[PDB]
């Protein structure tokens, strides 16, 4: 049928700024919708905004599309970033006329840059026994640079905002 | 939610559309890094299933009242039937296309290969004490196949809801085998006035999903059932 | 040629949406239509019932909705079988002509010839290649249905024509007198003009009108299209590119058969 | 592909008369495929309410229709045919002719 593209894998951007995903599609239909939908970790799907191809660049919400008809470009840039905008957002086409499957795009997600900073390294050990010991990273998060058999999460954020954030980036052997 | 299945057996999902337009029902198939496609498009009035380009005749049926209780059955499944399956439908406006919550399946070539998560608490370091004034607990479950689980702090016989971070997806043990069994670790701070209290207590627990009855058994270390595994501490005094 | 045909055009754009439509025609008019809500046969002119029994009728209803469900279905089926890439079209024209009986009935695919039914059996064009073959198998499975084609072709049709032209002879045969206008068109070159004589409201289609000067047809007179309207009359512009200079003492001559012999005479002014 | 682009062709039933009623006629034939948006424009608007014939095809498979609409010609009033296809890189306008 027709094609899609979104080369991003993931983007990062602090809280309260902006962030543009782009998508490029290549269709031969002269009417057509272009949906934005997101994808939160709990694999669930969220309707966004839908684009008309015969409408103006829609602006609803905080959210907004750039039509490059010409160039069959729709950019979606999100506004006022919030940490629960943090998801894999994805972009798709279908037909106007006739609305039938859409065909997604590889996909993009989001990582939100957290909202003082103060770098350390600490160890813990086990509770209900011993012989255990893993490493803790926390703040950071401006040094966001975070990487044999040693295991590292990484960064961390999940309504646990009312605490600071205090980036906690565990390792462990 | 989460299903796991062996290699040529068959697994039956279930979509939950609100209440959908007891209409025209699209299932949609999601894997990691791929984009989501169309595999088969259901049609109540008539009880056709179109299956989509390159599809097996039989691989997939739907059935069922499209309300609420509407079924796709998958039959000789393989490794690549893994991953997320929704079932989509467009509203009557044909303005957007509501998307049914989606069902991670899981396929491996034997049944021994999925095993429970084993859990443990570590209690924060000394040093944190006088740095922060504030603590961190860290909970681990290791050990696990698939990355089917829900982890969550209880204080007090509480659930929590605050101070906790929780990476979303696990780190696997060891990438270059398929089969791999993944990692999962969570921070949750307290202050200085709960964590010194000896008389505070502190469970992550970790609902797996595995195995259930029907699933057929033969090794000999503990059947690996969908089970809530809990570890456990308390607070130092000194 | 006067052939009684029906068409049959069934679009499948993608998997949700297929549109189907029945209609017959008596060559260029149309005198009957499909109603899939009700499933009927609705006639668009009192005598489009021609000159069958209602009982006859009503047979006809019931097999059109079998064979129009059945055929909508069945390539809703085998659309991936016969390799029938989506979005397709799928037209079929069959009915009779004359005096005489000629029956003839073919379905295309994409716009281009596919198969065609010839005696008791379902032929392909030896141009469309293997999938009219297949098509032509799935399509003679059924010797029942191959039997009702032939009926419906070489009994049905030839009793039908007759009497809806004997019922519709009245409306087929009447005069409806034209009406001229002339204009100017876009300007073909430097110093020369476009003349365009208009000619809307004549029935029957035969129609003749040209520029002249004088008693002399002017040659570079070009005929257009002959275009319909929603009643059942026809329009048709005629052009004529002149010298500006040379405009003078032309005009535009029809004749209709309505007319009876008085031609309408258009005289050209360029004040 | 094979694919037949649209012949569009506007005309009137009656010669145009200011304040005379009066219909505008656009025939789109010989396309392939059917699915084809077209409208009548007055003044770059488009006229709601506009009938069109049911679809039908010639000897060739093309496809043809009308569309008709009841109009009141005026002096300053201008009109137009406008058809989208899947052969037009864009929507392909006619313009009705009166002088
Ligand atoms: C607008 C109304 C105008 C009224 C005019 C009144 C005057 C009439 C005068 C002249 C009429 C001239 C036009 C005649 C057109 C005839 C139609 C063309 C032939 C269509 C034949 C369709 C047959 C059909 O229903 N197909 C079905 C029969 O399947 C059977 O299914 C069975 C199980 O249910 C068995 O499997 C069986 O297999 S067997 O091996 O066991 O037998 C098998 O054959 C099958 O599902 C469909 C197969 C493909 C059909 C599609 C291709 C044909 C399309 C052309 C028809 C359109 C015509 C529209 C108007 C009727
Ligand atoms: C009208 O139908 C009758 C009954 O079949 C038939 O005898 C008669 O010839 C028909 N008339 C015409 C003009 O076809």
Redesign the interface.
């Known amino acids: 049928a027709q094609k899609v593209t979104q080369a991003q894998s993931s983007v990062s951007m602090p809280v309260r700024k902006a962030v543009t995903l782009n998508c490029l599609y290549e269709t031969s239909w002269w009417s057509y919708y272009i949906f934005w939908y997101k994808q939160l970790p709990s694999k669930e799907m969220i309707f966004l905004i839908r684009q008309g191809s015969d409408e103006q660049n829609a602006k609803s919400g905080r959210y907004s599309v750039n039509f490059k008809k010409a160039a069959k470009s729709v950019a979606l840039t999100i506004s006022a970033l919030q940490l629960e905008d943090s998801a894999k957002y994805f972009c798709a086409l279908g037909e106007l006329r006739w609305p039938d499957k859409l065909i997604f795009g590889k996909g993009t997600r989001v990582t939100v840059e957290p909202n003082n900073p103060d770098p350390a390294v600490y160890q813990l050990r086990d509770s209900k026994s011993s012989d255990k010991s893993v490493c803790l990273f926390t703040d950071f998060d401006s040094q966001t640079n975070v990487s044999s058999d040693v295991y590292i999460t990484d960064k961390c954020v999940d309504m646990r905002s009312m605490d600071f954030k205090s980036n906690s980036a565990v390792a462990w052997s | 939610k989460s299903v796991i299945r062996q290699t040529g057996s068959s697994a039956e999902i279930t979509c939950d559309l609100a209440e959908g337009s007891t209409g025209y029902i699209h299932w949609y198939l999601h894997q990691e890094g791929k984009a989501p496609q169309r595999l088969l498009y259901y049609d109540s009035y008539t009880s056709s299933v179109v299956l989509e380009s390159g599809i097996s005749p039989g691989k997939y049926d739907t059935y069922g009242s499209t309300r609420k209780n509407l079924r796709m059955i998958l039959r000789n499944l393989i490794e690549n039937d893994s991953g997320v399956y929704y079932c989509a439908t467009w509203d009557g406006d044909y303005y957007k296309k509501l998307f049914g919550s989606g069902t991670t399946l899981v396929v491996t070539e034997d049944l021994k290969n999925v095993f429970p998560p084993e859990v443990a608490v570590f209690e924060p370091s000394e040093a944190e004490i006088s740095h922060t004034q504030k603590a961190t607990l860290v909970c681990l479950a290791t050990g696990f196949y698939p990355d089917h689980v829900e982890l969550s702090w209880w204080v007090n016989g509480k659930e929590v809801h605050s101070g906790v971070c929780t990476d979303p997806q696990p780190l696997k043990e060891q990438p270059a085998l398929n089969d791999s069994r993944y990692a999962l670790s969570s921070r949750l701070r307290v202050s200085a006035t709960f964590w010194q209290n000896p008389r505070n207590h502190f469970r992550c627990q970790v609902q797996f999903y595995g195995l259930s009855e029907n699933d057929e058994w033969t090794q000999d270390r503990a059947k690996p059932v969908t089970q809530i595994v809990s570890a456990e501490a308390w607070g130092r005094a000194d | 040629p006067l052939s009684f045909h029906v068409?049959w055009?069934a679009?499948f754009?993608?998997?949700?949406?297929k549109q189907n439509?029945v209609?017959g025609?008596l060559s260029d008019l149309?005198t009957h239509?499909w109603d899939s809500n009700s499933s009927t046969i609705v006639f668009l002119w009192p005598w489009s019932r021609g000159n069958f029994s209602n009982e006859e009728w009503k047979e006809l209803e019931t097999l059109f909705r079998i064979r129009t469900i059945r055929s909508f279905?069945g390539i809703?089926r085998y659309a991936?079988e016969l390799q029938f890439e989506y979005?397709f079209?799928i037209?079929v024209?069959g009915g009779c002509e004359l005096k005489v009986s000629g029956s003839f009935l073919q379905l295309?695919y994409?716009?281009?010839?596919f198969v065609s039914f010839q005696n008791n059996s379902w032929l392909p064009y030896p141009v469309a290649g293997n999938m009219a073959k297949h098509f032509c198998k799935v399509l003679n499975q059924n010797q029942h249905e191959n039997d009702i084609t032939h009926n419906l072709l070489s009994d049905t049709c030839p009793r039908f024509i007759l009497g809806l032209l004997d019922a519709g002879k009245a409306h087929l045969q009447r005069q409806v007198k034209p009406?001229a206008?002339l204009?100017?068109?876009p300007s073909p070159g430097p110093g020369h003009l476009q003349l365009?004589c208009?000619v809307?409201?004549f029935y029957p289609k035969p129609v003749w009108v040209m520029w002249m000067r004088g008693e002399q047809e002017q040659q570079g007179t070009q005929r257009g299209?002959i275009?319909?309207?929603?009643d059942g009359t026809w329009?048709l512009?005629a052009t004529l590119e002149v010298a500006a200079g040379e405009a003078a003492d032309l005009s535009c001559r029809v004749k209709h058969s309505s007319l009876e012999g008085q031609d309408i005479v258009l005289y050209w002014e360029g004040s | 592909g094979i694919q037949r682009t649209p012949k569009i062709q506007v005309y009137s039933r009656h010669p145009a008369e200011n304040g005379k009623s009066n219909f505008l006629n656009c025939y789109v034939s010989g396309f392939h495929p059917s699915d084809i948006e077209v409208d009548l424009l007055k003044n770059g608007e488009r006229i709601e309410k506009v009938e069109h014939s049911d679809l039908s095809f010639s000897k060739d498979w093309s496809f043809y229709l009308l569309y008709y609409t009841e109009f009141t010609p005026t002096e300053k009033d201008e009109y137009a045919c406008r058809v989208n296809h899947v052969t037009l890189s864009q929507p392909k306008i006619v313009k009705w002719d009166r002088d």
């Open positions: 068409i055009i679009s754009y993608n998997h949700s949406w439509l209609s025609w149309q239509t279905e809703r991936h979005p079209e037209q024209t295309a994409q716009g281009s010839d009406e206008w204009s100017h068109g365009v208009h809307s409201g299209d275009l319909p309207s929603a329009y512009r």
